[PDB]
């Protein structure tokens, strides 16, 4: 994945500082608030009717963690994302029927959550690398759709 080692290095160093528990929750959370058509996929999650119902929804908070776990596990394999995510793409396609276009929203929402937590430390170049990472994760999650 066209990620210079310098890019690759920034990504990693930032990610070590990440509270995966919390970030996953926020990201999945904002995704459901900002692009509320993405709530249809999670009706088993209980109340989603207000910003707070969501951000605070435990099932949301739990699922967010699962998601970020899958994410970290891609940062440990930048060089074979398609494979790392092959089972997970397939699932989202065949069982969940999610439009791959939503993986990009999540990705950009992820990036805004990183920017929110880290501040000036989330510099344009670090963002830039992060955009390469989320796009690859996303491409890799759409890869097995058929």
Partner 1 sequence: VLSPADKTNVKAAWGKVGAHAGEYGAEALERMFLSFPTTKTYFPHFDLSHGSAQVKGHGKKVADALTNAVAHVDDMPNALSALSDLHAHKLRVDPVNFKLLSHCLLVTLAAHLPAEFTPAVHASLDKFLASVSTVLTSKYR
Distance (Å, whole) CA 116 – CA 38:
22
Closest CA to 72 of 4, 128, 16: 16
- Partner whose binding site includes residue 66, from partner 1, ligand HEM, none (CB under 5 to 8 Å by kind): ligand HEM
Mask for 84-113, x = binds ligand HEM (CB under 6 A)? ----x---x---x-x---xx--x-------
- Answer whether 30's CB lies under 8 Å from 109's CB: yes
Distance (Å, whole) CA 103 – CA 67:
11
132 is known to lie in a ligand binding site: no
116 is known to lie in a ligand binding site: no
Dig out the tokens for 67 from the structure: 């998601």
Question: Using the rule CB under 6 A, is 66 a contact of ligand HEM?
Answer: yes
Helix axes 20-34, 101-118, angle to 10 degrees: 120
Binding site for partner 1 (CB under 8 A): 26, 29-30, 33-37, 40, 51, 54-55, 93, 97-102, 108, 111-113, 115-116, 118-120, 122, 124-125, 127-128, 131, 142, 145-146
- Partner whose binding site includes residue 88, from ligand HEM, partner 1, none (CB under 5 to 8 Å by kind): ligand HEM
Residue ranges of the binding site: 1-2, 63, 82, 92, 143
């Amino acid at each position: 994945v066209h990620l210079t080692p310098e890019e690759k290095s920034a990504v990693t160093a930032l990610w070590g500082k990440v509270n995966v528990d919390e970030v996953g929750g926020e990201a999945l959370g904002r995704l459901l608030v900002v692009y509320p058509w993405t709530q249809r996929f999670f009706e088993s999650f209980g109340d989603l009717s207000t910003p707070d119902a969501v951000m605070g929804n435990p099932k949301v908070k739990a699922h967010g963690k699962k998601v970020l776990g899958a994410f970290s596990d891609g940062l440990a394999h930048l060089d074979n994302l398609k494979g790392t995510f092959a089972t997970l793409s397939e699932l989202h396609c065949d069982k969940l029927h999610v439009d791959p276009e939503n993986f990009r929203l999540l990705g950009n929402v992820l990036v805004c959550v990183l920017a929110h937590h880290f501040g000036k430390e989330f510099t344009p170049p670090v963002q830039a690398a992060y955009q390469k990472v989320v796009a690859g994760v996303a491409n890799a999650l759409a890869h097995k759709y058929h």
